[model samples]
Target: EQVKLKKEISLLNGVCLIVGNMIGSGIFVSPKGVLIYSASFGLSLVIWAVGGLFSVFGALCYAELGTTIKKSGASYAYILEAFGGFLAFIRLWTSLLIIEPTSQAIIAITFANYMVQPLFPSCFAPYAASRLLAAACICLLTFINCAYVKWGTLVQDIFTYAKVLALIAVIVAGIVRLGQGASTHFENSFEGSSFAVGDIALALYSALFSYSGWDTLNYVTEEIKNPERNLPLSIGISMPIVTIIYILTNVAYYTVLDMRDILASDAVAVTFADQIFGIFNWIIPLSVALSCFGGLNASIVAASRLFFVGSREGHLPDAICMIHVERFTPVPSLLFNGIMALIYLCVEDIFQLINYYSFSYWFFVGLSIVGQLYLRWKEPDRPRPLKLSVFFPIVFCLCTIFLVAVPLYSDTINSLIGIAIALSGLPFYFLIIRVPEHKRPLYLRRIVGSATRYLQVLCMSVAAE
Candidate 1:
C-alpha cells in the first residue's frame, strides 16, 4: 500500500503544538539565566516580551513561506528553494547531528529530573535514575509517533492544556498575592538592571530559548488542516498567548520570591510552589514534568518530519523517508530520530552542547529568513495566500543577527567550535551526496540497499505517493 502524511491536525492541534513546545522546560530552567543576565525583575520581563515578539515576527515569515511553499520541512525546505542543496543540506546535517536530538535529550532529562525530584524530596535525584527515565520517556514517545500520527498529536493536545493550566495557576496565585499588597517587587523594577549590550543579548537568548518552538507547526505544513488559513491563524493565536503566559508567570515568581531566591533555586516554578502551594506543592513538579513530556512529544513529531523530508529529498539514505503503509506515519524517520535522542541521553553536559550549537541554529534561521526575502523578490508573482508585511522579515533578520553576533564576544570559542562542527558535514556531503548515484561503490550501494529492504519490511512502509 502507498501512503503519505494525512492532513489530520486541526487548528486547535496546531495551536497546541506551538504553545506546548514553547512552554517546555526552558521556562523553568532559563529564569535564573534571564534574571542574572538582565540583572533585575523588570528588565527580565521585558526581555521575555521582546523574545516572544521576536518569535512572532519570525513565525509570520514562516507562515507566509509555508502557505506558499506548501512543504513539510521548515528551514530546510525553504533553504532548498531559495539557496539550493548545499546550504539546505548543511542545515539538515547540523540539525540531525546536534540541534534536533540534543534539544530533545535536554527536554527529556528535564522531564526525568522533575519526575524523579519528588521521590528524593530533600536532595538531588540520582543521575542514573534520571537518565534511565529519560531514555524511557524518549522511547515511549517515539513508539507513539511511529505507530500513528493522531495518537502522538493527541498526546500533544492533552499535555498542552495541562501545562497551560499549571501556568495559569501560577498566574492566578501571583495576582492574588499582588492584590494582597505584595507589590514591593514592582517598586523599583529597573533598579540594578544591566544595560550592557552583551548582557541584553544573553538575557534575550535565555528568554528566546523558551520561545524556540514557535515554528514547530511550520514543520508539518502538509498536516495542518488548511495550510492557508490554519497556519497563520494558529501562529497568530499561539504566540501571543504564550507571551502573556510567560510574562505573567515571571510576575508570579517575583511576587513570591526575591531575586536571591530565584537565582538560588534550580527549579523556579517548583520553588514558587513551595512558597505558595505549601503541602500541595507536589503539583508544580508534576506539571513541569508533564509540560516537558508534551514538549518532547511535539519535538519528536516535528523533527521526524524534518528527517523524512530531508531523506526524501535525497540528503540521507532512502530508508527513513518512507511512511508506514498501515499506520500512515513516518515510522522509519521517527525511529531514526528516537535512536539519535536516546544516544544523546548519555551525554553529561547537555547545556554545553546547547551553548556550542545554538549559534548555528540562529545562523540558519537568519539565512532562511533572508531566503524568504529572496524568494519574494525572485517570485513576486508567486501566489501567497497568507502574505505578510515586509517589515516582519526585516525585523526578524536584524534580531537574528543580534542574537548570532553578540554571542561572539561572550562565547567566542564555543561559537567557533559550532561552525567548525557544521563545516565538518561538508566532507560527508562531497563524499556521498555530491557523488553521482551510479558512480558510487558497488559494496556501499549493496549495503545501503540491504538496509533499506530490511527496514521496509520491518516497518511495512513505502515512499509517499
Candidate 2:
C-alpha cells in the first residue's frame, strides 16, 4: 500500500515555497494592469499596500485551518472533513481539471516569454517558441520532481533565493537611480482624473491576482514541522515581507519613470533596468525568467500533492497514487500535471487562460472559506489550535465573497465558462463514486470512459467559448 509522504519539508522550506510561489511571474507583469487603472503613482502604491493587507488576512485564515488539520491536500482535505466525500471530490477534480494545470501553464509560458532574448531574437516566432519551450520546461521539471522529491525542494529553494535576490537588486538599482536625480514627469500622474471607487475596486481585484499564492504553505501541511505553529509563522512572516517588496519595487518604478512610460512598456522591470544600467536589459529578463521558473517548480510541488491526495481519497484513479519507491513522491501525478500543463500551453492564449484560471481560483477560495465556516458549526468539538475569533471568519468570508463577486460582475462570460467547467466535473465524480468493488476491470473501464467523455466536452467548450 502507498503510504503518506515521509520526506518532510522543513519550516524554512515551507516559507520559501509560499513566498517564492506567491511572488512569481505575476509581479513582473502586474504593474501593467495597475497602470491601466491609475496613472497616479501615489495611488498605485496605496493599492499595493491594501492588496498586501487582504493577502495577509487571507493567509491567516488558511494557516489556522492548515495547522488544525495537519494534512496534505490543503483545501481538498479540509473541505473533505468539513463537508463530506462528494464535495471534497468535486473540489479536487476541479483543481486537477482546471485550476492546477492552468496555473502551471501560465507560469511556464511566462518563463518562456522571458527566455526569448537568449533563445530567439526574431519577435515573429515568439508565440510558437514560447509554447514549445514552455512545454519542454514542464516535461524536464516533471522528471526532476519524479526522480527525487528532495531535489525538487532543493531546486525550489535555490530558485526562490535567486528570484528574491534579483528583486532586491532591482530595488537597490531603482533607489540609486532616483537618488542621482533621475527626473520623472509628475504632471502625468493623475491622467486618469475620472477614477472612482468602482475603478479602485476593479484595480484592487487585479492587484489581488499578484498576491494570489500567499496561502500555498497551507497546501502541503503534513510536510512541515510543528505545522500548528510554523504554518501561521510562515504566513505571518512572508506576507508582510512580500507586500513591502511589492510596494518598494513599484515605488522604484514610479520614481524613475513617469506613469505613462511605465504604462507603455510591456516589461516594466526591463525598461527600468535599461534606464538605470543602459544595455543591461539581460539582467531583468534573466531575473524574470528565474522568477517564473521558480513559480513553475512551486506549482509542481503544491499541485501534484493535491492530485495525490485526491487519488488516495478515491476521487482520482489509483494509478495517480503511485509513489516513487525510493523518493516517496507521487511521481505519476507530477508527470500528469506537467503533461496537462504542456498541452494547455500549446492550445490556449495566455491571457485568456489566466482569466479563466482567476475565475476558477477565486471561486474555490471563496468556497473553501465558506467550508471553514461550515466546519466551525458542524464540528464544533473538533480541536482547532488556532480558531479565528467569531468576527474574523465573518470578516474573512465577506472579503472573500467580495473578491468572488467582482470577477463575475466584471466578466460574466469568463465567469460562466468557469462555472460550466466546474459543473462538468459532476459526471466524473458520480462515475467514480459508483464503481463497484467486485468487478475491478469493469470499474476501471467505466472510470476511464467517463473521464474521456468529460475531456471531450471540456475541449469542445473551450473551443466554442
> Which pairs clash in the backbone of model 2?
none
lDDT of 2 by residue, 256-335 (tens): 76766788877788778777767766878888888988888989989988887777776776656566544676766787
Clashing pairs in 1: none
Clashes per prediction? 0, 0
Which regions of candidate 2 are displaced past 4 Å?
Answer: 1-3, 118-122, 181-195, 434-465
Error of 1 at 65 (Å): 1.5
Candidates in order have lDDT scores of 0.88, 0.75
Give the Cα RMSD of candidate 1: 1.4
- What are the per-residue Cα lDDT tens digits for candidate 1 across 265-303? 878888999999998898999899999999999999989
TM-score, structure 1 vs. true: 0.97
The segments of candidate 1 whose C-alpha lies over 4 angstroms from its true place after superposition are none
